[PDB]
Amino acid sequence: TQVFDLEGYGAISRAMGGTSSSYYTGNAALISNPATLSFAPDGNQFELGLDVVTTDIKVHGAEAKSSTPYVGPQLSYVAQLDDWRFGAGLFVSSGLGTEYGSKSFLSQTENGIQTSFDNSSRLIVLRAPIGFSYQATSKLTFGASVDLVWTSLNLELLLPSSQVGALTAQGNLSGGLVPSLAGFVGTGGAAHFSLSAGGAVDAVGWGGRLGLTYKLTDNTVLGAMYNFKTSVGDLEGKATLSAISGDGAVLPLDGDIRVKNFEMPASLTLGLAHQFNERWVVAADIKRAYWGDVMDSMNVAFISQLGGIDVALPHRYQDITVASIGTAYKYNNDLTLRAGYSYAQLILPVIPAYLKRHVTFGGEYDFDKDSRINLAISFGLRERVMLRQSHSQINAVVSYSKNF
Numbered sequence: 035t036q037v038f039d040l041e042g043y044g045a046i047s048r049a050m051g052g053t054s055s056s057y058y059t060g061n062a063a064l065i066s067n068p069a070t071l072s073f074a075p076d077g078n079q080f081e082l083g084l085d086v087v088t089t090d091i092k093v094h095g096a097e098a099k100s101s102t103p104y105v106g107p108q109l110s111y112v113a114q115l116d117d118w119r120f121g122a123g124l125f126v127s128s129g130l131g132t133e134y135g136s137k138s139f140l141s142q143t144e145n146g147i148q149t150s151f152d153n154s155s156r157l158i159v160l161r162a163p164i165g166f167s168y169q170a171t172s173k174l175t176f177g178a179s180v181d182l183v184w185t186s187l188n189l190e191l192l193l194p195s196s197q198v199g200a201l202t203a204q205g206n207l208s209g210g211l212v213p214s215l216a217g218f219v220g221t222g223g224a225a226h227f228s229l230s231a232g233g234a235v236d237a238v239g240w241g242g243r244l245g246l247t248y249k250l251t252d253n254t255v256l257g258a259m260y261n262f263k264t265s266v267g268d269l270e271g272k273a274t275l276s277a278i279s280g281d282g283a284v285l286p287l288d289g290d291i292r293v294k295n296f297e298m299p300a301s302l303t304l305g306l307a308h309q310f311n312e313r314w315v316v317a318a319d320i321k322r323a324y325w326g327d328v329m330d331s332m333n334v335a336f337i338s339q340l341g342g343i344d345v346a347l348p349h350r351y352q353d354i355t356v357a358s359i360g361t362a363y364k365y366n367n368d369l370t371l372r373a374g375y376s377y378a379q380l381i382l383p384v385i386p387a388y389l390k391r392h393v394t395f396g397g398e399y400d401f402d403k404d405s406r407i408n409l410a411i412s413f414g415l416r417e418r419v420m421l422r423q424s425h426s427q428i429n430a431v432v433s434y435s436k437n438f
């Protein structure tokens with residue numbers, strides 16, 4: 035998910051700054067760099083995880099806070115069969131999460147009138163890969179995976195007269211419902227979208243992933259994996275447009291939205307992992323999320339009986355280059371403590387921008403040598419993005435790999 039595109043997935047990878055390319059990082063490697071999967075301890079792994087995110091947004095004097103938690107699964111298994119590793123897992127996760135609720139100015143119709151409309155968002159994505167890793171020459175490990183993605187979303191966005199007009203001017207907002215709803219909303223209104231068998235407003239695309247590894251030294255590994263842009267489908271499902279008059283009179287139309295071109299771009303990451311001491315470990319990858327390679331427009335069509343409304347949004351997103359280092363010491367044949375960091379390189383309270391800086395802590399507590407527990411937590415370092423607004427996330431994951 036991450037509401038634009040970044041790096042770092044997995045219980046042990048999150049802890050190491052989202053490094054992943056060259057080394058082992060559990061079954062998440064299925065959605066990271068399947069080649070890496072080869073390094074797995076002989077046998078058949080079987081992890082269970084609990085990924086967790088939460089954002090604290092503070093938009094503005096006019097305070098509007100975010101919180102007023104979605105926890106996702108991680109059933110995965112990676113069987114072995116000489117030189118050949120085979121895995122398949124489900125990987126649920128949030129990333130987009132806000133709940134300003136109905137009380138703040140985001141709920142203030144033009145003319146600062148308090149509507150009782152909610153302002154919230156939640157994008158959930160469940161990746162589900164099926165791939166493999168292969169040992170070709172105790173130096174070359176190839177691996178790839180093809181996953182079924184299932185995106186779901188629910189919004190509670192409110193737009194004041196102003197920006198609805200702004201959307202018109204820009205040549206973004208077309209419709210038919212517009213003419214007619216104009217003059218009822220007027221320079222003092224606000225429109226409001228609400229998505230909640232009930233469609234749910236979800237989609238079902240496909241994802242691709244292939245990567246390699248090369249033991250350059252016996253203390254240096256080189257890695258790379260290409261990530262095909264996921265082919266999500268169209269987000270479809272019941273929704274409710276509510277023209278709100280310049281004084282609070284609500285006109286609710288019920289129809290069905292269709293979000294088109296929700297892009298999750300491709301990415302090529304390159305990294306290494308050195309171990310200049312049979313205890314202390316270090317990792318480092320450079321990621322490239324190819325956003326500039328997205329030229330079409332995200333289209334939000336809404337259809338009711340009385341008519342429709344549509345918003346076009348062209349992409350215009352340049353490339354994102356993520357650099358990230360990792361590390362991991364072994365307190366002993368029990369504890370393993372890791373810690374990494376990763377620097378990455380339209381105020382809209384309901385969809386906060388990805389953060390660039392990140393600090394990550396974590397460790398691993400083995401207790402069987404056939405069972406293990408990984409624990410990671412990543413800090414989204416605060417950025418200050420008229421409407422001043424700022425936020426900072428806290429991601430925490432925990433997986434228990436019962437080496438069968």
Ligand SMILES: CCCCCCCCOCCOCCOCCOCCO
Pocket residue numbers: 189191197198200201227293334345382
């Ligand atoms: C965008 C998420 C998909 C959910 C559909 C809701 C569609 C509603 O409109 C989103 C448009 O937001 C843009 C802001 O308002 C325009 C302000 O003027 C800015 C000029 O760049």
Ligand SMILES: CCCCCCCCOCCOCCOCCOCCO
Pocket residue numbers: 195198199202211212213214215216217219220221225226277343
């Ligand atoms: C997105 C919600 C739809 C509700 C539309 C009400 C917003 C309309 O505009 C208010 C600004 O007034 C000026 C617009 O021009 C008059 C009619 O609209 C025609 C545009 O093709």
Ligand SMILES: CCCCCCCCOCCOCCOCCOCCO
Pocket residue numbers: 308316318320355356357358359377379
């Ligand atoms: C050779 C042994 C490993 C020693 C540490 C490796 C550290 C290597 O470099 C990592 C570079 O990436 C992180 C830098 O901070 C981000 C700066 O902006 C750069 C553009 O991507």
Ligand SMILES: CCCCCCCCOCCOCCOCCOCCO
Pocket residue numbers: 084086105399407409430432
């Ligand atoms: C034997 C080692 C002990 C390590 C335990 C790690 C588990 C401890 O907590 C980590 C932080 O908790 C994360 C999320 O909050 C709990 C929510 O409920 C989740 C399942 O529905």
